[PDB]
Structure 1
């Protein structure tokens, strides 16, 4: 059972050259509770962004090259990454764009934050056919004193 979890700006932008131009601590909170105690699969670039392992969690990093941090598990392929998670209720793929694209056809659930922010970036969430996905949960939030933009948490499940 694979789930992707991503924060998407307009045009499904999930990343760019620099830090995203926003401050969304509610989305961080959402990511933390939806990934808590689950194995997480990420690309090397996302591994690098995070700086250290997500705590209380198998962290699984895809790299074509051998690993460089023994605190986490390093794998050379999508299927190795899944196998490295073991036999768990739910594997979270936390990105980035190349990893999302490879895992989406395998996934049964998406956790997306849709952020009402206009950014240009080089990396985007894959197109998810909405005939393949049913939205089971949707929860919209205005920007506030803590959150720079409005955003909406959504969970979709594969049909």
Structure 2
């Protein structure tokens, strides 16, 4: 089973200049909660952005080129990335925009944070079809001294 996890600002912006232009500790904690002890698939730019392995997860990087760090696994296709996960209950696809586009059609589940922030972007989450997803969990948080925006954690299942 393949899931996508992402945080989306207004207009589905997910990134700018190979970074995420917000700072929400509670959302990173949610990300860690939902990915720990699961393989995480990411594109090379997202690998470069994160800048180091995500511990406690098998990190699988997509690139057409040979790999450049044996602390993670490198693969050259969607099919190869899936296979490299092995027999696991749930594969987490952790972006970025290009990778989300390719895994969206296979995904059974989306873990989306909706962040109340307007930000310029150069990368978006896919413009997916709302009707085809059932919201099964939704949890809103107001901003606080640690988190400058309000945000909502949503889980969607493919209908």
TM-score (norm 1): 0.97
User: How many Å separate the matches in 2 of 1:77 and 1:71?
Assistant: 19
Preserved contact between residue 19 and residue 49 of structure 2 (Cα < 8 Å): no
**1:99 Cα deviation from its structure 2 partner:** 0.3
CA root-mean-square deviation: 0.9
In the alignment, which residue of structure 1 is the partner of 2:13? 13
Matches of 1:150 and 1:30, distance apart in 2 = 14
Q: Deviations over 1:20-55 (max 9, x none)?
A: 332200000000000010000000011111121111
Q: Distance in 1 between matches of 2:19 and 2:83?
A: 31
Matched positions, count = 159
- Separation in structure 2 between the aligned mates of residue 15 and residue 76 of structure 1, nearest angstrom: 23
Question: Is 1:143 the counterpart of 2:125 in the alignment?
Answer: no
Deviates further, 18-27 or 70-79: 18-27
Give the structure 2 partner of residue 81 of structure 1.
Answer: 81
Q: What runs of 5+ residues in structure 2 fail to find an aligned partner?
A: none
Q: Tell me by how many angstroms 1:18 deviates.
A: 5.6
For residues 87 and 18 of structure 1, do their structure 2 counterparts lie closer, same or farther at Cα, with a shift above 3 Å needed?
Answer: closer
* Unaligned segments of structure 1, at least 5 residues: none
CA gap 1:104/1:56 in 2 versus in 1, 3 angstroms: same
* Cα contact 2:53–2:71 (8 A) shared by 1: yes
What per-residue deviation string (whole Å, max 9, x for no partner) do you get for residues 64-93 of structure 1? 101000011100111100000001000000
Q: CA deviation at 1:127?
A: 1.6
**Residues 135-144 or 44-53, more deviating:** 44-53
Q: Secondary structure at the match of 2:130?
A: coil
- The list of structure 1 runs, each at least 4 consecutive aligned residues, that deviate by more than 4 angstroms after superposition, is none
Q: Which moved more, 1:5-14 or 1:46-55?
A: 46-55
Matches of 2:88 and 2:100 in 1, distance apart? 19
Could you tell me how far apart the structure 1 residues matched to 2:101 and 2:63 are? 15
